[PDB]
Design a protein around this ligand. Structure first.
Ligand SMILES: Nc1ncnc2c1ncn2[C@@H]1O[C@H](COP(=O)(O)OP(=O)(O)OP(=O)(O)O)[C@@H](O)[C@H]1O
Ligand SMILES: Nc1ncnc2c1ncn2[C@@H]1O[C@H](COP(=O)(O)OP(=O)(O)OP(=O)(O)O)[C@@H](O)[C@H]1O
Lengths: 412, 417
């Protein structure tokens, strides 16, 4: 009886397994309520029930264990964490906890944790003690994330143009500037698919803020990583909670010297959600957004960095532009010189169905000298010197007609 | 007899046919009171009286049966539902209930439910836990709702342009951006007429929020579906109640693998009613509207989706723009990237009496690849590539002057490449 195993099984199968235990009011209930009832009926059997989840501490000091399957949504199937446990184990908001859970007594309304088996995929040890705020921050350039999954596929074409224009490194702040209808939704999943095949050691998390539900289901069923999202029919507090949970889990995993990658969608809408949630403090609003509010999402984007001790924390967020709203324009202007990697998309190139729509002249990475080989800098700069006088769309033709012949593996 | 039978009969017949039973002081009273009195006078005859209505459960735990004819308005002619009954039948706020009702007692003012005959057009067998919150959400491009009647009528012309510009699929989030005096009201009824004539299997519901009464009567007398409305002389709580009742009925009907379509008018007015009703707790507000309030209408628009299990839930809402109020501007800005289908109208094209006035260059549907045939995408792309360099006012001329010859099934036989 593993809680996570229940949460990953379809609701249609939950009815058959729950009805076979003597439960009748499961005819039309939510998956969380069904799982809670099934556990409470199986808890009467005195058998060991196992559970796990990502910790989130509330204001009162006890917190709960949110589920990654439910995108860290508050529900009856959550696990209560005692404050004394948080005093026994130095637990912060974001620690993945696994262990045996106990049945609820009279008047508790939530399950509680009996034993702490593992903390962040490791036994309860305090060896990995260096919190992310205390780790030194070198430049992103001490590794390259090559997105080259194959040799002769149409998918790798966009990834090959990405590798040629803006190399990706461990712990880089990626910023994808994209107008509407410019190939931004498939560009993210193309990167995510290439991440899992090329760098399986990296923990890949795709965060979708203020996204349509059908595209959420498309993404979470097509990417082999951890896809978390919050649909537009949810309050901005939900978006803020999901974003902070994801960033805290990433920080805690990086504290274990792991390489974590975050693909954030619509950072502008995340900043809008923050402006909505933050209790307005100063009346100095410009363009509709409170200034101090923008302090909160920046910190999110500020978490991405390379670590001198170990591991990395990579964040690639998409900045929406040409939306017609001055709010998104002000957000993008405030996020101008924050990232060390910028990937620009052109709407005019997407009109003529050239699907790699990267503005090569307006795309690049800072400190790319250490992200590439000594001889790799020369070829990329020579290629950029001849693309500079070219047109905005005529450059992509010149790229594809030469890139679709050979690979980036052994150039010439 | 049947309460519903009375609700659909004119008030003139309620007085003439009801006074013949011995009640003559119901003339100067409301239709709901007239129906209540007629039922109470016909109930003393010991004849089985049947009733039905859409369930609405209150906060206290009991519910009533609102009438679709009265646009789900609270009245004396409603049927009380006991909570204990709700414990036997795990009923939600959208379940349409039909069955035998009992007469009220002296001192009681509402009818009660004796027997539960049908639940959502079916025997009470709710063994499938197909609640909307648990159904999977595929994309809206499984089946296409084509608005091509083939009648070759000027009416079908606007619908033919609609099919050419933005195809409609099962379970789509439609957003009709429309300035004032640009052909919005006529565009909706054209869609509603084409839905009932082409796709009778779909349950069509036309929701009108903050609408004038004469236009409400115009709409409910021209659409072959279920027309529900709440006039502007009613509080915002009424608008919220009507909208939530409609969306819950749609959700419950989708739970039975049915294809439900919702034509919502003035989603901006629904968001305004929500902002009025929502208990402002967030001390922030932009443009006059509270931000947290906007969480409530979005969910309505968020309900529209395709379902992997069965049926669909289609919602096409009209977003008002260029009204001069920053409130509507903020609402439209918050609903910018929410829908997967956008149909824009231009007042300048409508000003020249070319009334379809569709902004072709800024209208379209995402993932339209699965809504059309393999060769239909090519023809649409070729047609859009030649409209792209044209203006707004000159594109509709080129479309209409060429569309009135063929029927959008032969329109792709000339200028082939
Ligand atoms: N690399 C590609 N290869 C093939 N087809 C693509 C590619 N990129 C985009 N497309 C097609 O073009 C469309 C581009 O839209 P996409 O989903 O990429 O994001 P977008 O439309 O820019 O995002 P938004 O919804 O915010 O406008 C897609 O629907 C897809 O069918
Ligand atoms: N399809 C059409 N064909 C011909 N004339 C039309 C059409 N649609 C609208 N009109 C003209 O426009 C006027 C009615 O348009 P409609 O009622 O759709 O405006 P509206 O935008 O809904 O109004 P409001 O801006 O007040 O909501 C009438 O005078 C009618 O002559």
């Amino acid at each position: 009886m593993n809680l996570t195993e229940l949460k990953n099984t379809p609701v249609s199968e939950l009815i058959t397994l729950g009805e076979n235990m003597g439960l009748e009011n499961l005819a039309r209930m939510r998956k969380q309520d069904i799982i809670f009832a099934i556990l409470k009926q199986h808890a009467k059997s005195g058998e060991d029930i196992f559970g796990d989840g990502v910790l989130e501490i509330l204001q009162d000091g006890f917190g709960f264990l949110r589920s990654a399957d439910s995108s860290y949504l508050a529900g009856p199937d959550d696990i209560y964490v005692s404050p004394s446990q948080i005093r026994r184990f130095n637990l912060r908001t974001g620690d993945t906890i696994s262990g045996k859970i106990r049945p609820p007594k009279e008047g508790e309304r939530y399950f509680a944790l009996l034993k702490v088996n593992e903390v962040n995929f490791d036994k309860p040890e305090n060896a990995r003690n260096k919190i992310l705020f205390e780790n030194l921050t070198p430049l992103h350039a001490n590794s390259r994330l090559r997105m080259e999954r194959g040799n002769g596929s149409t998918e790798d074409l966009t990834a090959r143009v990405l590798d040629l224009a803006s190399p990706i490194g461990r712990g880089q702040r990626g910023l994808i500037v994209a107008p509407p209808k410019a190939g931004k939704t498939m560009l993210l999943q193309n990167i995510a698919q290439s991440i899992a095949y090329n760098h399986p050691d990296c923990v890949l998390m795709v965060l979708l803020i203020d996204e349509r539900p059908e595209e959420v289901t498309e993404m979470q069923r097509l990417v082999k990583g951890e896809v978390v999202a919050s649909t537009f029919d949810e309050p901005a507090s939900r978006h803020v909670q999901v974003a902070e949970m994801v960033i805290e889990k990433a920080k805690r995993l990086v504290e274990h010297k792991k390489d974590v990658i975050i693909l954030l969608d619509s950072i502008t809408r995340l900043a809008r959600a923050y402006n909505t949630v933050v209790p307005a403090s100063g009346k100095v609003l410009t363009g509709g957004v409170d200034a101090n509010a923008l302090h909160r999402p920046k910190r999110f984007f500020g978490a991405a960095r390379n670590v001198e001790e170990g591991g990395s924390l990579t964040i690639i967020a998409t900045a929406l532009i040409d939306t017609g709203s001055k709010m998104d324009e002000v957000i993008y202007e405030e996020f101008k010189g924050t990232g060390n990697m910028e990937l620009h998309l052109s709407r005019k190139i997407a009109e003529k169905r050239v699907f790699p729509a990267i503005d090569y002249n307006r795309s690049g990475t800072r400190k790319e000298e250490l992200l590439t080989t000594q001889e790799e800098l020369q070829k990329m700069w020579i290629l950029r010197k001849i693309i500079h006088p070219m047109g905005e769309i005529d450059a992509m033709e010149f790229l594809i007609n030469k890139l679709a012949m050979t690979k980036t593996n052994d150039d010439f």
